[PDB]
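agent> fetching stored inputs for the ULT docking request
agent> found them:
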Amino acid sequence: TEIEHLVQSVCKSYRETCQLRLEDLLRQRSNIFSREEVTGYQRKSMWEMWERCAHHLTEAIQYVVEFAKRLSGFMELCQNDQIVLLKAGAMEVVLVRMCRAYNADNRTVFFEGKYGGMELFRALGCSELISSIFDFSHSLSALHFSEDEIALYTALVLINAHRPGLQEKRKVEQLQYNLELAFHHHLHKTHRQSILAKLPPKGKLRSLCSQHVERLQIFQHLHPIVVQAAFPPLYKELFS
Ligand SMILES: O=C(O)c1ccc(OCc2c(-c3c(Cl)cccc3C(F)(F)F)noc2-c2cc[nH]c2)cc1
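agent> prediction call returned; pasting tokens
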């Protein structure tokens, strides 16, 4: 029941931090930006779209930090290792969480209260990155990832004892092994082990996140946003 308790704990942390309810995202699928509304977004300054998107991504990261803080044993890791794991993994989790807000039927994402295609983001002038994020979301949406699958998979995106610069690798390994057992137990109970072969390959999430954060750092150098900093030790690693 330790592993059953861990599944319950991880799913509760996820529910408390997931931002939007799945049934709300699903109900809103017929609420699509009009041609007029899309043109309104396209005419916005690159720098206004950056401010909006940077705000949304900052809030998304903060919810992921709250998710990690509520994972059994995470707060018992040394601060160095908590920061190493969050710096490496929190934006990877944001990118995975996006698949819930993605509709593969019409290739739209839930953004500021309605669904829109990647054309909504034209003003940012990084069509290749936006295309890559949509493609990644399309790949995960095809799995029909359940809420518990997202919760347990994203716990494992964070709790990775291979991250360079960990000081207590054995302690991270112990948490990782328990979360791997929780995920694999849960897939067996729900007859969903078939998704293991279909999950993103080794390096796909890492390289997408590298490209994404590189672009956020370029925008932040050119046009810095003001962050409502909730996690000073982590903020200090990302901002300068
Ligand atoms: O509340 C906080 O204390 C806090 C700390 C870090 C943080 O990091 C966001 C981030 C960004 C990012 C974002 Cl989301 C928007 C604008 C600019 C940036 C960037 F690139 F300049 F940092 N990019 O990656 C992260 C991140 C955090 C952990 N792992 C990656 C937000 C809030």
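agent> quick read of the result: The pocket of ULT is lined by residues 54, 57-58, 61-62, 86-87, 90-91, 213, 216-217, 220, 225, 227, 229-231, 234-235, 238-239 (CB under 6 Å).
agent> awaiting further instructions
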